[PDB]
Amino acid sequence: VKKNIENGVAHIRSTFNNTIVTITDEFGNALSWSSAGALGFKGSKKSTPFAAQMASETASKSAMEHGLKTVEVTVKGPGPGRESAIRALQSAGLEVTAIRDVTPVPHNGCRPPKRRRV
RNA sequence: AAACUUGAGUGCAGAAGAGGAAAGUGGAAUUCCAUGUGUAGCGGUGAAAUGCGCAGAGAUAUGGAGGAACACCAGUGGCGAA
């Protein structure tokens, strides 16, 4: 009931409303997930870099418990906590081979929602 | 009534163009469906709540369905009577 991997990819989704972190193998398999809402932060605070740092630290701790050593960063969303999440990943002992922002670029398909009037 | 080539067209040699009409091909992305991993949140806001989710949501990986628009080029740029 244990997983042993040495190289992997950490997916970090940071939106202005919340931060979610997970780590997977090189073939995208899920071990554990972390979110600011689960950590305890509610409402606005979930977007703060500190909550992102805590979630990234928890996710990296579980990844290294399963045995991860080298990880590649997969960043999603425009939130401000992406850099804090990456630094927490680095400080957890894992080695960042490279960083890539996989934020989906819609070329021209689909109509975005109405601009807010507030 | 009779001449002219300057206006207006024509011939000859060249130029660019999101001008229009009809078929075909394509990548990104959104939604949905199925399945594997996985746990208690997701989403949202000034802050919240409705709502969705312990029947397994959200995240993640793969495949499928389908509609719609064409990121970069792109520019006091081009084309058209509008």
Query: In chain A, what are the domain boundaries?
Result: 1-116
What's A103's DSSP letter? -
Which residues, 6 or more positions from A112, have their beta carbon under 8 angstroms from its beta carbon? none
Which nucleotide does the CA of A29 lie closest to, via C1'?
A: B37
Measured CA A112 to C1' B68 distance, in angstroms? 12
Interatomic CA–C1' length for residue A112 and nucleotide B9, angstroms: 53
Q: Three-class SS of residue A65?
A: helix
Query: How far apart (Å, rounded) are the C-alpha atoms in residues A16 and A118?
Result: 17
Q: Are A89 and A60 a contacting pair, CB within 8 Å?
A: yes
Task: Determine contact, residues A14/A79, Cβ cutoff 8 Å.
Answer: yes
Task: Give the per-residue SS3 of A10-59.
Answer: EEEEEECCEEEEEEEECCCCEEEEEEHHHHCCCHHHHHCHHHHHHHHHHH
Whether CB of A107 is under 7 Å from strand B: the answer is: yes
- PDB experimental method: cryo-EM
Tell me the Cα Rg of chain A: 15
Distance CA A55, CA A47 (A): 11
Q: Is any atom of strand B within 7 angstroms of residue A4's beta carbon?
A: no
Which residue places its CA closest to the C1' of nucleotide B49? A43
